[PDB]
Amino acid sequence: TATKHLFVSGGVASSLGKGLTASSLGQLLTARGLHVTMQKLDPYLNVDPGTMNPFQHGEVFVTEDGAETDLDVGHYERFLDRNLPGSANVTTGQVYSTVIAKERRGEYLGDTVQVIPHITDEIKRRILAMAQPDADGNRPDVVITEIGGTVGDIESQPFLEAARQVRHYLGREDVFFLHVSLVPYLAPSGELKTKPTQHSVAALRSIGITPDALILRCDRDVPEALKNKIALMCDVDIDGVISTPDAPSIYDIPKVLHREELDAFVVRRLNLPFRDVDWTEWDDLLRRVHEPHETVRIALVGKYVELSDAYLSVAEALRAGGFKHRAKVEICWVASDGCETTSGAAAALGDVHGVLIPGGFGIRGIEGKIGAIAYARARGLPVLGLCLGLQCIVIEAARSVGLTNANSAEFDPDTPDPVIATMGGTMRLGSYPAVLEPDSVVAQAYQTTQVSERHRHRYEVNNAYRDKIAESGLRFSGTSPDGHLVEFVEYPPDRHPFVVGTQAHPELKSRPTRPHPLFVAFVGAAIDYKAGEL
Amino acid sequence: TATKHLFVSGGVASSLGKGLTASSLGQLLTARGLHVTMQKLDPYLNVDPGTMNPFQHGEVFVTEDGAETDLDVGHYERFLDRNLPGSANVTTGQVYSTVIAKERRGEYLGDTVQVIPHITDEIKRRILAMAQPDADGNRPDVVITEIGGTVGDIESQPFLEAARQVRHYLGREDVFFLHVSLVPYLAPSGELKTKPTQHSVAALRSIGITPDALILRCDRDVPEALKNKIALMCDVDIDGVISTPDAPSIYDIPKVLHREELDAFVVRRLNLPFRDVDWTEWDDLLRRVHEPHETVRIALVGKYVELSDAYLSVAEALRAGGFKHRAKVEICWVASDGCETTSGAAAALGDVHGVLIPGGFGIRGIEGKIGAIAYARARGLPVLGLCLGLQCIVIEAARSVGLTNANSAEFDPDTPDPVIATMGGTMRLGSYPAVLEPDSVVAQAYQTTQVSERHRHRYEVNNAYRDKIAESGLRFSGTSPDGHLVEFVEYPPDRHPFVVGTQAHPELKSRPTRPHPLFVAFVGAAIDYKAGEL
Amino acid sequence: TATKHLFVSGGVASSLGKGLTASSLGQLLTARGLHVTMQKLDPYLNVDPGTMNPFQHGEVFVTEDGAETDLDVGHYERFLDRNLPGSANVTTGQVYSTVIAKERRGEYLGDTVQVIPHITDEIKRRILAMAQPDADGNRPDVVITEIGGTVGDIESQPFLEAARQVRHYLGREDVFFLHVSLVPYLAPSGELKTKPTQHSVAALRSIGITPDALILRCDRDVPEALKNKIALMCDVDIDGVISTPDAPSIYDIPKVLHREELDAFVVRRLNLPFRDVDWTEWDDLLRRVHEPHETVRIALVGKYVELSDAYLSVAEALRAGGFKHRAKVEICWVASDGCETTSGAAAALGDVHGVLIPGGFGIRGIEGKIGAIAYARARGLPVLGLCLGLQCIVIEAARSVGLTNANSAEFDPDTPDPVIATMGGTMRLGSYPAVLEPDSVVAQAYQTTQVSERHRHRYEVNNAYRDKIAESGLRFSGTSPDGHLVEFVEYPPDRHPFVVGTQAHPELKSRPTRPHPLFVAFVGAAIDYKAGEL
Ligand SMILES: Nc1ncnc2c1ncn2[C@@H]1O[C@H](COP(=O)(O)OP(=O)(O)CP(=O)(O)O)[C@@H](O)[C@H]1O
Ligand SMILES: Nc1ncnc2c1ncn2[C@@H]1O[C@H](COP(=O)(O)OP(=O)(O)CP(=O)(O)O)[C@@H](O)[C@H]1O
Ligand SMILES: Nc1ncnc2c1ncn2[C@@H]1O[C@H](COP(=O)(O)OP(=O)(O)CP(=O)(O)O)[C@@H](O)[C@H]1O
Ligand SMILES: O=c1ccn([C@@H]2O[C@H](COP(=O)(O)OP(=O)(O)OP(=O)(O)O)[C@@H](O)[C@H]2O)c(=O)[nH]1
Ligand SMILES: O=c1ccn([C@@H]2O[C@H](COP(=O)(O)OP(=O)(O)OP(=O)(O)O)[C@@H](O)[C@H]2O)c(=O)[nH]1
Ligand SMILES: O=c1ccn([C@@H]2O[C@H](COP(=O)(O)OP(=O)(O)OP(=O)(O)O)[C@@H](O)[C@H]2O)c(=O)[nH]1
Ligand SMILES: *CC(=O)CC[C@H](N)C(=O)O
Ligand SMILES: *CC(=O)CC[C@H](N)C(=O)O
Ligand SMILES: *CC(=O)CC[C@H](N)C(=O)O
Numbered sequence A, B, C: 001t002a003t004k005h006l007f008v009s010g011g012v013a014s015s016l017g018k019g020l021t022a023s024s025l026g027q028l029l030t031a032r033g034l035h036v037t038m039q040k041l042d043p044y045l046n047v048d049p050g051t052m053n054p055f056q057h058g059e060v061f062v063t064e065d066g067a068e069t070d071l072d073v074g075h076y077e078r079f080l081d082r083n084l085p086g087s088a089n090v091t092t093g094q095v096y097s098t099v100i101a102k103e104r105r106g107e108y109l110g111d112t113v114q115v116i117p118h119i120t121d122e123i124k125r126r127i128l129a130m131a132q133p134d135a136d137g138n139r140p141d142v143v144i145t146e147i148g149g150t151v152g153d154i155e156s157q158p159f160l161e162a163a164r165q166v167r168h169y170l171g172r173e174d175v176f177f178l179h180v181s182l183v184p185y186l187a188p189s190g191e192l193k194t195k196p197t198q199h200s201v202a203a204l205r206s207i208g209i210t211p212d213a214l215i216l217r218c219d220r221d222v223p224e225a226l227k228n229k230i231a232l233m234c235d236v237d238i239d240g241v242i243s244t245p246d247a248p249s250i251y252d253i254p255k256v257l258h259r260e261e262l263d264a265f266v267v268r269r270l271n272l273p274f275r276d277v278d279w280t281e282w283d284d285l286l287r288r289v290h291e292p293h294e295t296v297r298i299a300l301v302g303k304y305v306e307l308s309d310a311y312l313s314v315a316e317a318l319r320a321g322g323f324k325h326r327a328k329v330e331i332c333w334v335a336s337d338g339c340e341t342t343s344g345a346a347a348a349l350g351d352v353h354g355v356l357i358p359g360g361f362g363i364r365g366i367e368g369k370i371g372a373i374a375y376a377r378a379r380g381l382p383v384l385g386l387c388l389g390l391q392c393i394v395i396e397a398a399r400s401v402g403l404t405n406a407n408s409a410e411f412d413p414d415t416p417d418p419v420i421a422t423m424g425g426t427m428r429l430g431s432y433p434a435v436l437e438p439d440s441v442v443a444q445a446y447q448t449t450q451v452s453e454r455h456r457h458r459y460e461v462n463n464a465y466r467d468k469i470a471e472s473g474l475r476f477s478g479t480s481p482d483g484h485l486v487e488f489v490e491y492p493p494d495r496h497p498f499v500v501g502t503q504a505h506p507e508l509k510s511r512p513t514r515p516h517p518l519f520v521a522f523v524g525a526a527i528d529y530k531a532g533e534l
């Protein structure tokens, strides 16, 4: 049948969890054998999130095709176990620059270029593009489009109008509206309130959209009497009124939605091929999530100590590495600035079982990350470095063999030894192939000598320093196919059981149901270190 | 005191006449000795109206500084008798491209770039820029900002939010909101309806704006009982409820607003220096408008026969030329396509007293305009050619002396004689100086040999053909100061009493209270032709 | 099938003609063989319109069962040719007093009595009651419910909410929403505007109602391009976008709606039994409306004659009387106060062909109505008196025979001769039987001696004065079955060709397709007077 469009909107307030609810619905539909693709509409004017501070706004996700996207695409890829195109993230910035650029070229042939229909046609074009056959030739069954911003706000109006037009042009049989609302609890009276959902749905209806179902985000179960009140006042089928209480883990959200039979309601309402959910893969994940056999502590040596969306894909990849070993990864958020000195690094990393040095696109404090690697090497702690992490492993190795002032030309342009430098240079974005040295730590982890990983960097290992850096025992165990670019570094296992660096972001290809081989090997080495210390 | 901001919004429906009401208020405040400047906020995405078809969307106005703007700037200049900057026209296209370009350069330093505050800050910046001292050093007393689009529509939301923020930041003492509404008449019941104004004001209030006054656009006088109902339901001072019935001429609108004492209400509400209106100049204009001593028929040989906004400044300049002679100019709208043949041109121009060949930026049908000039020359009819008009006078002169296939390379790239060609070339926009031949028709009209006029063209008279074209008797009576570019052409008065062409758009510098010298001389020649035919 | 509910709402402004559009649709569906009943929901607090000044708010219609209702019930009866129950008019006043009375008796059993659901349940009950089998045992096919007030106003909110709940409970298959909007014309630009319809439909959608069709009230045909714009922006089937221009006569509206195929769209959308319209009866009416063979002038001697709805059923009955004779009745609206003196009555009634003295519930000036009858008797003008009219005929007869101070005790309680008096008394409402004198003017008009007419009065002919009044020649040609109450009066044809009075309101039983026998005889006598004057 025709590709179906399922729009996810939000009401009352932001940060209710629309993205994770949409992803969980995507997981449930995928588990029913449906081909699901997902898309995020971001009402911000940044053409891409590359200009945003990730320490304030969250990580930048990078797709296989090299697009810098909102972190939500990461949630979609993790719940669908699918590579999404750069088209899966639409911003107001992209839409307006595209339309204005076409206007300047005279492509609208003398027309007054307007929000309606020219801006809404562009958004609609980007929504409908998701229903085109992919590279393998497959057309999706369902396109889940998450509409960023809140209903009733100015910024979301062109997106919501485009979604209303998609419904008008494709008909009610091919389009479904899911609206996420808040049911707050008032502690003095002890009651849940439906009034915000009532008003939010009236604002949604006022812009021409009739919700087919409602996600009632709450800190508790929404009683049947409240669901009945909402069904009546909002004119939503009672089977489409979904009590969605805060879940203990993000992996529990599909079970919350399935208990309320939201996915079965969606399949019936869109007249999609029906098949029962195959719970094999997700039940296996939930056993690894809720029933670990051991705990392991990993230091994430980033900008700060607060649990951060700036390292979301890294944190998820670490946990997934744990799941593979039926282990619980406890992340010790360590501020890199505190690891600069040997006593500072000892106080911060003395009780961990592994040290992860993550990526740091646009950051400035590097001496703390180098300090953490120097401590971990001496302590015998496993190390996994990602992009900036590999660069810090390379800088620390060069300094350990006499190049005292070795650095990246990015962080010290006046360094006499730029062991990390541009090839200014070439920004490497998206998937790049690498060839691994057979029997190396990285080749043993991947169980192959030919791999591909996603990149986001313009600084590379300076090849003029390979022989000098190798004096530390560090091996260039992975390179580009022509051998010019260093892609992976590692110490021999007889010197350090696990010290590995990668120029790429393997965390982006990690899934909770498909852990990344490097994170599996890293967590495995951390479990080994813990057992050796007992 | 502080520069005041007066915002003009529209409700119920578009095309009510907001621009002319704002201009008329601008005239009334100017006549009270206040320094008034005006600005139009256009919600369209066209960075400038240059890509719009003027035959569908109206003429492009060109300012002294060379900006291509909405025709509304023309209304402002005509009612204020002032040159306005390119900043007097803000479009959504300009705002979004400026903000997106700053975002791409990293000027927002890691911020999420949003409609609020980044888009609204840019609009607010453009509104507040109008309050800066001009080139002569003068700061305006009042900035009248017309908000395009209708209240309740999506496209106007960022502009209205910016205006609300201007009020918030400057205070109620420095900001005034004027809302234009429709009071429709229902013929079966014979009654006027206030309900649309009631609902429009509630929509305006819902976005945070309280109107200080209301323009009640109607086909009849709004009775006191209806004004009282509106004052009460909309909470507007009865002195700010303005009955604005459709006026016989646009020049009558200041008298309609003054009778209702809107300008006195505005001056008192904004605590502006009070002075009575000096009616000397406007009463003089109204006597020329309503009490002409003679009538004269002028053919406007444009694309079509319907009264058009595509030639608004030309039509206004023709009427102003008439006012100077205490004459009524009757415009005979003649489709150029019908003047290609000698019999067609005779049928179309046989009963007129003058022929105006207007500008035609982006048009295709030129043979009809050349045909009209050939007929007018043989008939002894006065001719005034503007931009394309001069080019058509030059082409017709070249063909009359044997260059049968003479043309502009714009309309016939394969012409063996490109008498009009690029210097591709250089687009000339805005004010350019010209030096006139003393005792020429053009120098006698201007009463000076040094002039400046506004341009909008890239094709010029090909200097290689000057000697050949002059064989017709045509004189290059005006040039650029270095003598390289032809700016004016004319025939000797002994051959044709008035056949003049200009590369510029003198109509743009015309005002109803200050007619342009070329239009005064042209209409004067048309009055002479009429009298000679009696 | 199930009884269908068709709701008629209004937007933009009041007095657009919702009632006549609904009635015309009722006529079209009746002509397709459907059993249609109609109901008006009035948002005013008057329990019945009896306390309203009819000279400000329009006539009070009286049903067979004696309910005093809004004049709209009259339009319904005239277009359906059916007697409607008192239940066909619901007011806010009725609903709130019913619910408050139930609350005071404890019928809500400890509940908080609320607008939702208690007021809306009462309105819904009154809407659904219209679908119950009538006295003959027949259940209607369609109930057309007109919702008074304008969408977006406070007063209509409970009615609109009840209609939304009827849709929710019965489903989309049994409920249809028709929304009436205004398409205004802007004379300076010459354009029709769709913006008010766009905004009105968004307000209707915001309160939970999706219109199935739109009535576009306009002073001209709405072009296809504007209908296409509305279909797209309002998301209404193009087949349901109805151009409804101002019609020359109210009886032309069914043809306007049929041309746009609204009735066929309604029948298909509600899955009603389909049958073609039988145009026999209505085409016959339209020939009498548009092709009269003669014109006749009738004075309507009302207390206050603005040309208002205060005498709507009288004016319609006069026209229907004309139709029967293939004549056009021109109503000369005459203020009764000007007919008090014989010279005043001569100036006012000198050029008419008949004099109608209508009912005057709540009036104070009766001397002018008596003066008009005295003039008409002397002039030989036909007279038809309704309720107060009969009473004035009786008072004038008594005074013409020497009872100089004869009057009604209603207008002069101190009269020594109350020829009109109570039995205080008994208010007679609705249908009452009368027995007519065989071979009397009234029996010859009705062509029967047994009739029934609707009443609205408490004053009667004082039987103690029958012998004295009869001295004038006046006959008591119609009485109650027991002979106690005077129902009809007339002069013998050998004294006056046509001077008739009735205590009732025969105009209420008049239909354009079924003229009332008294109005047929009256207009016939007026045609005779005109012919005798030539
Ligand atoms: N059902 C649920 N229970 C608990 N936490 C939840 C949740 N749904 C979402 N979250 C939390 O919300 C966080 C942010 O993701 P979310 O889905 O809320 O984005 P969003 O759509 O509301 C905002 P934006 O569009 O700016 O990205 C997740 O990291 C997760 O921890
Ligand atoms: N009071 C009035 N009486 C008669 N005509 C009037 C009028 N006010 C305006 N008009 C007419 O309206 C025409 C268009 O100018 P107007 O002021 O209506 O623009 P606007 O602000 O409504 C639309 P936009 O923003 O797209 O330019 C004028 O050419 C004039 O003839
Ligand atoms: N198509 C049409 N052509 C001409 N006149 C029309 C018309 N439709 C309605 N009218 C006129 O409009 C007036 C108001 O009609 P109507 O009673 O139906 O309006 P309404 O329903 O808005 C008032 P209420 O609020 O009292 O119910 C009447 O004088 C009627 O004759
Ligand atoms: O009327 C409005 C208000 C706000 N916005 C948009 O809201 C966006 C901010 O998105 P948020 O959801 O964070 O709103 P908030 O900060 O105002 O309130 P909190 O829930 O965070 O406490 C901004 O990007 C702005 O464009 C509108 O579009 N319209
Ligand atoms: O909800 C809406 C509808 C329309 N619009 C905006 O209205 C603009 C069109 O401006 P108009 O005033 O011409 O509206 P219209 O054509 O829809 O109706 P008419 O009055 O002309 O009959 C378009 O440029 C669009 O962006 C909104 O911003 N929001
Ligand atoms: O927002 C509002 C305004 C008014 N009303 C209600 O409107 C009713 C008056 O109804 P009208 O339609 O007569 O309004 P109006 O007189 O103000 O304007 P026009 O006729 O000129 O169009 C009153 O009974 C009042 O309660 C609302 O319910 N809500
Ligand atoms: C990828 C990473 O962690 C840092 C990127 C840095 N700016 C670069 O190496 O180019
Ligand atoms: C100015 C005018 O009328 C036409 C401009 C034309 N395109 C040109 O000469 O460049
Ligand atoms: C019936 C009428 O209109 C006036 C008569 C008066 N109210 C009465 O007889 O009670």
Ligand SMILES: [Mg+2]
Residues within 6 Å of the ligand: A017, A018, A019, A020, A072, A146
């Ligand atoms: Mg999200």
Ligand SMILES: [Mg+2]
Residues within 6 Å of the ligand: B017, B018, B019, B020, B072, B146
């Ligand atoms: Mg304007």
Ligand SMILES: [Mg+2]
Residues within 6 Å of the ligand: C018, C019, C020, C072, C146
């Ligand atoms: Mg009605």
